[model samples]
Target: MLEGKVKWFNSEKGFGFIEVEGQDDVFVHFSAIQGEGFKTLEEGQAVSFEIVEGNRGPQAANVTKEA
Candidate 1:
């Protein structure tokens, strides 16, 4: 089950992209954004994580937002 939102996150050069509807657009890299006092992600919200297959293919684990 791959569900997602957060389709943009460029904390001015941080990282972004994660729209999982049909598949294709998942490369978040705000340190994997898990919230740690420095993590980041905002531009309208929506999330549900866990899709780690490789390193440069899909990356977005342990995310939470959508409520």
Candidate 2:
């Protein structure tokens, strides 16, 4: 799992990018969220997720909001 702050996120659209500690942006999708707190996702929110190879690039999987 990778923990990072939400560099950019859109709750209504259910997609965003996370700035991983010491790394570049990681693309995230709504399908990766398995919990109930995604409805509140917003810019600068803290979160953690798994990094997996996507068809286009690295993608966040099994995402969850971090306290």
Candidate 3:
């Protein structure tokens, strides 16, 4: 039940950070979203994802925006 709001994301660059309430911004990268395409995250969009340790630090997985 992890979620956050988009801070800044680039469709071209395909990377950005999402800000969680009472926490720091978490980095995000574009992935093969579940049953979706040609999409991108902009600022202020609320989304849900599972945050866990990755190659770097904390990262988002299975990210799904509010629908």
Candidate 4:
């Protein structure tokens, strides 16, 4: 898993990017979020996620908020 902070999120669009340390931003979709209730994420929120080799490029998977 990789650690990062949420760069930004578009609730209406249900997508966002995560800024990983020393790495390019990873694409994050709401479907990949791992949590209950609303899947909206806040900018600058710390999170952990798996880096998956997506069809286009690297993407964030199994994303969860940090405690």
Q: Pick the candidate with the highest TM-score.
A: 4
Q: What is the lDDT of residue 22 in candidate 4?
A: 82
TM-score attained by model 4: 0.84
Which candidate model has the greater TM-score, 1 or 4? 4
| Backbone clash count for every predicted candidate, in the order shown | 0, 0, 0, 0
Q: TM-score, each model?
A: 0.26, 0.77, 0.75, 0.84
Against the true structure, whose lDDT is highest? 4
Global fold similarity of model 2 (TM-score): 0.77
lDDT of 1 at 15: 60
Angstrom error of the Cα, residue 55, model 1: value is 7.1
Cα-based lDDT at residue 57, candidate 3? 71
lDDT of 1 by residue, 14-42 (tens): 56677887777777777777666645677
lDDT of 4: 0.82
Lowest lDDT 10-mer window, candidate 2? Answer: 33-42
The Cα error of candidate 4 at residue 44, in Å, is 0.9
User: In order, what lDDT does every prediction score?
Assistant: 0.71, 0.74, 0.69, 0.82
User: Model 4 Cα displacement at 12 (Å)?
Assistant: 1.1
Q: Write the per-residue lDDT of candidate 3 for residues 1-67, one digit (tens) a residue.
A: 6888878888785656788886666766777123246447666777788777777776767777764
Positional deviation of 18 in candidate 4, in angstroms? Answer: 0.5
> Would you list the rank order by TM-score, best first?
4, 2, 3, 1
Off by over 4 Å in 4: none
